RNA sequence: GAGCUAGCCCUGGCCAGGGUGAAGCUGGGGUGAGACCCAGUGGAGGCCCGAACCGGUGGGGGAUGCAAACCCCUCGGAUGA
RNA sequence: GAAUGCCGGCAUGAGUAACGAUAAAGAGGGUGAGAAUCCCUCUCGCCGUAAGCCCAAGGGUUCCUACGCAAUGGUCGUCAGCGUAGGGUUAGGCGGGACCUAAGGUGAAGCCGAAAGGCGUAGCCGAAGGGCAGCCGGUUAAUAUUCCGGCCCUUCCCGCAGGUGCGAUGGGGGGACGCUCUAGGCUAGGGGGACCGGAGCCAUGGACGAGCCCGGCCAGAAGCGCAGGGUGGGAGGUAGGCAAAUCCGCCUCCCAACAAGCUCUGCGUGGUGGGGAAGCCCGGGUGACAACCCCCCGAAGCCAGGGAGCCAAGAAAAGCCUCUAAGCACAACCUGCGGGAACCCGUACCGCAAACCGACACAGGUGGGCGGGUGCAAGAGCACUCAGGCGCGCGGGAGAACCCUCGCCAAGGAACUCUGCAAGUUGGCCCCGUAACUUCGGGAGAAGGGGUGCUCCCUGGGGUGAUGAGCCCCGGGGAGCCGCAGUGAACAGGCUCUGGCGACUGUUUACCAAAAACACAGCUCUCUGCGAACUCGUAAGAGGAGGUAUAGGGAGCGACGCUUGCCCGGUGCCGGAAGGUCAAGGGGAGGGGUGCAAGCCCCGAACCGAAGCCCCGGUGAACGGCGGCCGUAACUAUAACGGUCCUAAGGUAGCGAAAUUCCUUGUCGGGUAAGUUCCGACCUGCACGAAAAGCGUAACGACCGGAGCGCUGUCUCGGCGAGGGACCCGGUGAAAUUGAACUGGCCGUGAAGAUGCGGCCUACCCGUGGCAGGACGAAAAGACCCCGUGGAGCUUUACUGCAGCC
RNA sequence: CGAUGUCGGCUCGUCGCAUCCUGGGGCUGAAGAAGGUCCCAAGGGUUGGGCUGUUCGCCCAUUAAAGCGGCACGCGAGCUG
RNA sequence: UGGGAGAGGGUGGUGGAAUUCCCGGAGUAGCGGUGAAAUGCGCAGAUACCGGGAGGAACGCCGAUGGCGAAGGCAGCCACCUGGUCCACCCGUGACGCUGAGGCGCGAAAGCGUGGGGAGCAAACCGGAUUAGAUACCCGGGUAGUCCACGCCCUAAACG
RNA sequence: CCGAGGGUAGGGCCCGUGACUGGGGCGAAGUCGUAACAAGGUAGCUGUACCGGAAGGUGCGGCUGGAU
């Protein structure tokens, strides 16, 4: 049956992307915390 | 004259349709339509603020001239009477000798090929618009402005009208469609005659689908819900209201008056509606 | 977090085939004129039968599954909310 | 040493279950250390509205070639979507961008908010919508509308010639639209040909034939032909299209008009360029100088912005055309031609799946297009089959129980059972025929029955031609033939009578409930005069609605028919300028502290002072409510009638042992041999009753009752048979569970149900297939119950606040 | 209560005997035949339907008879539901 | 052919009196009602009086024992459209007539459907009286309806 | 071939009968009131509608077959 993950590159970039995170106060805190933890990827990798 | 169907489906047994007899043109004037932005009852926050709305037939907005004092003295020929999906009245295409074309809402008895005109000098004839102070007492009017130059607000739905009852200073007294008696400024414009399509009220939709075409989504009773949802929610089995019948938001809904008490327009309202 | 799900908004797409035969129209009858009757034409409908498609009624299987909802048989809708 | 402790390791179950669709395999040859599993050949089977082909998502080298087999692959492996390496993706015309706008997002101006931020007309962004110029064939191991070949085309720049008042982000036109049905002419695709081309074949009894088998086209500028789309022309007036305008709009006159004309598209033809089968030889050569024609069927595609009907009345903006403004008019623009210029990104491969979503090479999920032939009435249904693709990554045997899926059955025929659950029966088409009742539509495929193949003869009409033959379509009549049986296989209703509930089609607890529940047209109450009421938000701002009482919000009821009684004392709501009560504030009689003092400071009576509450009315499709006792009539029984207590007032019509009835299987009637169910009645209704509607109602229902006919392995009552497992051998090899175990019966005992204690009995050691009585067997720190001054959802005339409103 | 699945049915039994039948008896208000009552006796047997979820019970048609109880109100790692 | 009378019919307009309600004024202790009363209304200012407004229905006098129509039935006034009928002339047609089963149309009131309207009245209903009682007669309230449009119903002491 | 009839299925009409139910006629020796006949104590009757233990009442319109 139809499962929950229905990948869509535009949806992924527009929802979790770098520019979405930089728009809001909450999103910038995400990047700050991910940079502070040392994450190799700050935002989900999506092709485009 | 409303038209019936033979009962060849269960819904056609009672379904009725307007006869569309006054209609002489089946396409709108291209320069006078614009897209009507559908809301689904949602506001600029994306929240539903009017329940049970959406899914109706696509419609274009016909631009209606609700001023007419725009063009005092300039007569116009009634070129056509057309269907308007955005209102219960029909609409009338006017060809001004100016060359400008405009829509008004179609009065009762309006005739294609007759002329109409607006202004303090206009004859007292169906379709003409004049300031209230120049229309004689007893005349029934429609498309009445409530304040000078703010546009027609009153008596615009199919079959409705207001009647001039008297004069008092700068103001005239009208009996509004609701039966309310109200002072309206004499410089407010009105159109003589009642709004047409008076058989509108006698239409029987006939089936649930017909409400859906109109963008009316099903309305679910408070008594059909749960206590999280509605004052009338819950109870084992059916339940009577068990309290004063209330809205989803808790306020009472049988009799409780809701007009704001200290409203400035109260000085201009003579008698509240009676029925 | 609405890439699942619910509602709405914008813009596209899909619905084999068969059946029933509303209004209207035309002709004939009828009448003072009519209503109306018959025939033909017509092609309406949350109309009918039935695939795609959407479902999930009853039973059987499965039950450390093929599957954290599946399989078989049967069954509902299928121009419409 | 224990915490169902934590991490790791390793056991048991066990060589056990299983190895993932029951579409299916066999042999020969090759390779190799090794072969059921890799390659090749032949035979067999499966799909073929796919299990084939194309595209979009998503995936991201999985593509091609060489080398390789540790692991991955449910076995094997020499193979591979795996390991290593090398190679592979070519565009002005395909898709996106240097174009347009949609919802929506963002956002000059502007508005709002403690901060963060929230809005916001224009503008901008935003596509699978609009717009825009490439078709056929060849080539690679692997790309091709991209390379090549042929024939076409677009934009930009510059130049030449001719033409014109040129010129725009401004004005106007246009772009530009629904649903259903549909005409004409075509194309795609398909069938046939005694005609054209072709390698060959004559078998096994016959056939050298109008034999069999194979193929008989594709693209193509200008021109031309056919079919369609679009569009009236001239002049005069002009105050409207936020400037201007010769444009457009409006008025008037002339002419033209279902014509033509101009224009545009489709189709055909067309210089030219291609393709080209079976068979046979080793993807390639040959066939071949291949032929490339006629007839029929024919779209849902094209002409298209076609036509008609209907109501629910069906985007925008740019490209384009036209108008003019600044300007500029040696410019500029238009047309023709010529030369030059033409960027960025994608392009492999999988793509109904072993490469996407499901932890797996997972029987599940995944949008668009093509989807041949024959027959069955039609069809994308069903059977078979083409092209093409597969046999589903463990096999080999055996022929037990039992399980699954399947076939048949004597006599009986629902006797089964909670229930005909399940399975039979029926089954398509044509003809005949068809009841109560009904809202006149229906009920209806009611029911029930007849026909159905093939052969010969005669004949009717239509389509295509030409009017004829041919082809194709729809018929009619007569005479025959065969079988148990002619929708001969596959696909394809069992029916009827009668209740309850819901009017109806719809909707729902994704994943235990599809219903009588929700919704629904329709009915009623009520609010709302527009900066509406109401909703969301602190606000600005939004929805309502670019709507205006025939409208919008809230509530109940729920098609329709006939109806909807009595009670306003309590609660609610509505009305009430009196009166009572009423906070801040006003007022300041009188009193107090302190100071020598003027003075400062404090308390404080009358009186004035809102909503609210009290009070007076109204109001039921507002919350709700709608009695009891005694007596009485020619026999009894009962009580129309009287009396009395109470109440705000005492239940009307209709219905009633009911989806409501306790006593209850009430009583009577019906049906049955027999009826706690069912149907019809009665009425002492424990405890119906009128919009939480009452009583009915045609039609409808995968709803829940009761009955009959038909038919059956449901049953008496079981038997046989088939395949997939179970079983045996080779390969691979889990699991929950497990204090340790050397783990029998009885009668007792024991914390009250003992393999484990006592007595007695019985018992050689160890497995394999089976069955489930026990191990108070497993699983889940009981889906009940209580306890905890544990938690959470919900309610209200519990308490206390808050928003909101007054 | 870190779970002992709970009515009825089906299937499969096995046991007790306070015996329904069949076998053996005594008493009788036992003429016979048929009964009544008690005693011995558990070897075997103890039907098919209608109603209802029913256990039970009532009813139909039979029968030699249509027994009553226990086994976690026997039996859901056996089925039903 | 020429005249006549008439509440004959249909449509659209339109006038005044009176009732009720609302507004402004003025005023106060009752009003109303009956056989007599009470309920009701009224100091929250009623009744009575004046001015203004709104709205529905019916048309005083004329009016008669009158007129018209087939019957039902028709009454302010104006206009339009339209029926029947009488008289005079004795001009035209030349028995073209009478009746009329069926059919068709009309048909008071009440009632019904959809939608308006709603002042007065008033079934049902509530209350006060009366009375032995009083589901009545009388009184105070009061919803259908009475009125308009369209469609039904088709009855009557539809009687002379 | 037709064919008595038999079988299957579905309709139409008539008769008898039925738990129960509706009113009617008669009986008369009862209970309740007194609706009509007199102005019958509210003139009567009437079509229709709504209502009431019952006769009946009321509304709307009609008749006189109404006393004074
Ligand atoms: Mg998706
Ligand atoms: Mg995407
Ligand atoms: Mg996308
Ligand atoms: Mg997206
Ligand atoms: Mg982003
Ligand atoms: Mg990481
Ligand atoms: Mg790094
Ligand atoms: Mg992130
Ligand atoms: Mg009709
Ligand atoms: Mg109808
Ligand atoms: Mg019709
Ligand atoms: Mg119906
Ligand atoms: Mg119509
Ligand atoms: Mg109209
Ligand atoms: Mg009309
Ligand atoms: Mg249109
Ligand atoms: Mg426009
Ligand atoms: Mg708009
Ligand atoms: Mg809008
Ligand atoms: Mg927005
Ligand atoms: Mg937002
Ligand atoms: Mg709302
Ligand atoms: Mg909504
Ligand atoms: Mg709509
Ligand atoms: Mg309209
Ligand atoms: Mg003023
Ligand atoms: Mg209308
Ligand atoms: Mg409506
Ligand atoms: Mg509604
Ligand atoms: Mg609802
Ligand atoms: Mg609920
Ligand atoms: Mg919630
Ligand atoms: Mg709450
Ligand atoms: Mg609540
Ligand atoms: Mg409640
Ligand atoms: Mg309740
Ligand atoms: Mg409830
Ligand atoms: Mg209840
Ligand atoms: Mg409930
Ligand atoms: Mg409920
Ligand atoms: Mg309910
Ligand atoms: Mg109920
Ligand atoms: Mg209630
Ligand atoms: Mg309740
Ligand atoms: Mg309550
Ligand atoms: Mg409020
Ligand atoms: Mg105002
Ligand atoms: Mg669209
Ligand atoms: Mg369809
Ligand atoms: Mg027809
Ligand atoms: Mg027509
Ligand atoms: Mg249908
Ligand atoms: Mg349908
Ligand atoms: Mg199912
Ligand atoms: Mg079944
Ligand atoms: Mg089965
Ligand atoms: Mg099962
Ligand atoms: Mg499981
Ligand atoms: Mg499961
Ligand atoms: Mg399945
Ligand atoms: Mg299936
Ligand atoms: Mg089916
Ligand atoms: Mg169907
Ligand atoms: Mg269909
Ligand atoms: Mg249809
Ligand atoms: Mg449908
Ligand atoms: Mg639709
Ligand atoms: Mg320890
Ligand atoms: Mg453990
Ligand atoms: Mg453990
Ligand atoms: Mg542990
Ligand atoms: Mg651990
Ligand atoms: Mg192990
Ligand atoms: Mg073994
Ligand atoms: Mg084992
Ligand atoms: Mg497995
Ligand atoms: Mg398996
Ligand atoms: Mg091998
Ligand atoms: Mg090997
Ligand atoms: Mg091979
Ligand atoms: Mg991946
Ligand atoms: Mg490749
Ligand atoms: Mg590779
Ligand atoms: Mg390997
Ligand atoms: Mg290996
Ligand atoms: Mg190896
Ligand atoms: Mg492996
Ligand atoms: Mg391996
Ligand atoms: Mg595997
Ligand atoms: Mg090797
Ligand atoms: Mg592989
Ligand atoms: Mg290479
Ligand atoms: Mg190119
Ligand atoms: Mg550029
Ligand atoms: Mg843009
Ligand atoms: Mg863009
Ligand atoms: Mg695009
Ligand atoms: Mg392109
Ligand atoms: Mg081309
Ligand atoms: Mg390549
Ligand atoms: Mg448009
Ligand atoms: Mg479009
Ligand atoms: Mg449609
Ligand atoms: Mg072609
Ligand atoms: Mg063909
Ligand atoms: Mg031979
Ligand atoms: Mg031939
Ligand atoms: Mg042609
Ligand atoms: Mg001008
Ligand atoms: Mg062409
Ligand atoms: Mg070739
Ligand atoms: Mg089609
Ligand atoms: Mg409409
Ligand atoms: Mg726009
Ligand atoms: Mg200049
Ligand atoms: Mg030019
Ligand atoms: Mg560039
Ligand atoms: Mg490529
Ligand atoms: Mg699939
Ligand atoms: Mg596909
Ligand atoms: Mg594939
Ligand atoms: Mg994979
Ligand atoms: Mg596999
Ligand atoms: Mg798969
Ligand atoms: Mg094909
Ligand atoms: Mg067939
Ligand atoms: Mg067929
Ligand atoms: Mg099928
Ligand atoms: Mg074939
Ligand atoms: Mg296989
Ligand atoms: Mg396999
Ligand atoms: Mg064996
Ligand atoms: Mg199978
Ligand atoms: Mg048998
Ligand atoms: Mg039988
Ligand atoms: Mg039988
Ligand atoms: Mg049954
Ligand atoms: Mg069949
Ligand atoms: Mg019948
Ligand atoms: Mg009928
Ligand atoms: Mg029907
Ligand atoms: Mg039949
Ligand atoms: Mg039937
Ligand atoms: Mg044959
Ligand atoms: Mg088949
Ligand atoms: Mg069927
Ligand atoms: Mg029936
Ligand atoms: Mg019912
Ligand atoms: Mg239903
Ligand atoms: Mg329901
Ligand atoms: Mg109903
Ligand atoms: Mg309903
Ligand atoms: Mg329904
Ligand atoms: Mg449907
Ligand atoms: Mg659930
Ligand atoms: Mg569920
Ligand atoms: Mg889920
Ligand atoms: Mg669930
Ligand atoms: Mg769940
Ligand atoms: Mg289920
Ligand atoms: Mg469910
Ligand atoms: Mg529901
Ligand atoms: Mg419902
Ligand atoms: Mg109703
Ligand atoms: Mg709020
Ligand atoms: Mg705003
Ligand atoms: Mg708006
Ligand atoms: Mg708005
Ligand atoms: Mg509105
Ligand atoms: Mg009826
Ligand atoms: Mg009563
Ligand atoms: Mg009350
Ligand atoms: Mg009250
Ligand atoms: Mg009272
Ligand atoms: Mg209360
Ligand atoms: Mg109040
Ligand atoms: Mg006073
Ligand atoms: Mg003092
Ligand atoms: Mg002192
Ligand atoms: Mg106060
Ligand atoms: Mg009411
Ligand atoms: Mg109460
Ligand atoms: Mg209530
Ligand atoms: Mg007595
Ligand atoms: Mg009863
Ligand atoms: Mg009973
Ligand atoms: Mg009942
Ligand atoms: Mg009850
Ligand atoms: Mg009880
Ligand atoms: Mg009972
Ligand atoms: Mg009981
Ligand atoms: Mg009984
Ligand atoms: Mg039963
Ligand atoms: Mg009783
Ligand atoms: Mg309720
Ligand atoms: Mg009922
Ligand atoms: Mg249903
Ligand atoms: Mg159902
Ligand atoms: Mg069997
Ligand atoms: Mg067999
Ligand atoms: Mg077998
Ligand atoms: Mg076998
Ligand atoms: Mg040991
Ligand atoms: Mg024990
Ligand atoms: Mg023990
Ligand atoms: Mg023991
Ligand atoms: Mg032992
Ligand atoms: Mg020991
Ligand atoms: Mg011991
Ligand atoms: Mg021992
Ligand atoms: Mg022993
Ligand atoms: Mg065991
Ligand atoms: Mg077992
Ligand atoms: Mg044990
Ligand atoms: Mg146990
Ligand atoms: Mg637990
Ligand atoms: Mg725990
Ligand atoms: Mg516990
Ligand atoms: Mg517990
Ligand atoms: Mg639970
Ligand atoms: Mg407890
Ligand atoms: Mg406590
Ligand atoms: Mg709590
Ligand atoms: Mg326990
Ligand atoms: Mg445990
Ligand atoms: Mg346990
Ligand atoms: Mg015995
Ligand atoms: Mg004897
Ligand atoms: Mg003895
Ligand atoms: Mg024995
Ligand atoms: Mg024994
Ligand atoms: Mg029983
Ligand atoms: Mg019993
Ligand atoms: Mg009994
Ligand atoms: Mg016997
Ligand atoms: Mg015996
Ligand atoms: Mg026992
Ligand atoms: Mg017990
Ligand atoms: Mg017990
Ligand atoms: Mg037990
Ligand atoms: Mg048991
Ligand atoms: Mg079980
Ligand atoms: Mg059990
Ligand atoms: Mg167990
Ligand atoms: Mg067991
Ligand atoms: Mg008079
Ligand atoms: Mg003469
Ligand atoms: Mg009448
Ligand atoms: Mg009347
Ligand atoms: Mg009436
Ligand atoms: Mg009395
Ligand atoms: Mg009234
Ligand atoms: Mg009434
Ligand atoms: Mg009424
Ligand atoms: Mg008379
Ligand atoms: Mg016969
Ligand atoms: Mg015979
Ligand atoms: Mg009387
Ligand atoms: Mg009397
Ligand atoms: Mg009298
Ligand atoms: Mg009565
Ligand atoms: Mg009484
Ligand atoms: Mg009365
Ligand atoms: Mg009369
Ligand atoms: Mg007399």
UniProtKB/Swiss-Prot annotation, chain A:
Gene3D superfamilies: 1.10.287.3980. GO terms for molecular function: structural constituent of ribosome. Keywords: Ribonucleoprotein, Ribosomal protein. Pfam families: Ribosomal_L34 (PF00468). InterPro entries: Ribosomal_bL34, Ribosomal_bL34_CS. Transmembrane segments: none annotated. Residues 29-48 have a biased composition (Basic residues). GO terms for biological process: translation. Residues 26-48 are annotated as: Disordered. It comes from the Bacteria. Part of the 50S ribosomal subunit. Found on the solvent side of the large subunit. The open reading frame (ORF) for this protein is entirely within the ORF for the RNase P protein (RnaP). The two start codons are separated by four nucleotides. Belongs to the bacterial ribosomal protein bL34 family. This is Large ribosomal subunit protein bL34. The lineage of its organism: Bacteria, Thermotogati, Deinococcota, Deinococci, Thermales.
UniProtKB/Swiss-Prot annotation, chain B:
One of its GO terms (molecular function) is rRNA binding. GO terms for cellular component: large ribosomal subunit. Residues 229-239 have a biased composition (Basic and acidic residues). Belongs to the universal ribosomal protein uL2 family. Part of the 50S ribosomal subunit. Forms a bridge to the 30S subunit in the 70S ribosome, contacting the 16S rRNA. May also make transient contacts with protein S6 during translation in the 70S ribosome. NCBIfam families: rplB_bact. This is Large ribosomal subunit protein uL2. It comes from Thermus thermophilus (strain ATCC 27634 / DSM 579 / HB8). The gene is rplB.
